[PDB]
Design a protein around this ligand. Sequence first.
Ligand SMILES: N=C(N)c1ccc(/N=N/Nc2ccc(C(=N)N)cc2)cc1
Ligand SMILES: [Ca+2]
Length: 223
Amino acid sequence: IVGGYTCGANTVPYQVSLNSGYHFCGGSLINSQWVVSAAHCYKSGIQVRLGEDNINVVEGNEQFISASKSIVHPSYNSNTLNNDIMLIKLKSAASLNSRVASISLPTSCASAGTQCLISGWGNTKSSGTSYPDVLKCLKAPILSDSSCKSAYPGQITSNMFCAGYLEGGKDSCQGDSGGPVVCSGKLQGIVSWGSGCAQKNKPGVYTKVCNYVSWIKQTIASN
Ligand SMILES: N=C(N)c1ccc(/N=N/Nc2ccc(C(=N)N)cc2)cc1
Ligand SMILES: [Ca+2]
């Protein structure tokens, strides 16, 4: 997260770190057994790390639970990043309370203008690289589809939305991928892609979670 702020330990209780020997992506806990992340975060041998603030220090609220399976969206296209969504099932149910909590799936797609909270342990620099230890947060509005498409001609599908700031300076970034965009207490987005980070007129592009609720629910119901 570029131009964000330190969330505060466990203030984003549904934020998970996907770990394969190191943090490589974010994810969002959507029930005790399931995490939503970006399909482009897919890899085998994922350990989901919940309860985590400083990802480099055991601070006492972590739950580390290996994935038992991952399910990449049937229509995920890694070239276009269309349908950049996956589900990761935990081998065991996470223990839920205030510091580790699922985030509700949306009942309806959020609108351009809605403020959201985007979070992750990704790069905090637009130029060069600095990875934070602790979870970073960014409040960012959903951008209109038109501005999103204008920013990224020929690239924005109905399964994507832009959020952030056209002026740049504030954005998700590499390592935030797969993490949440939560708006009004609902997971509306998944950190998906963008051209660099916090660049002018290159806002973050997010998987439009509301499009996937049926798929998420039915997948969970049968897996
Ligand atoms: N909001 C941003 N600017 C932004 C946020 C996250 C981000 N990271 N994604 N990285 C990323 C890495 C690999 C793939 C792939 N295997 N095809 C896709 C995307 C890149 C840009
Ligand atoms: Ca930790």
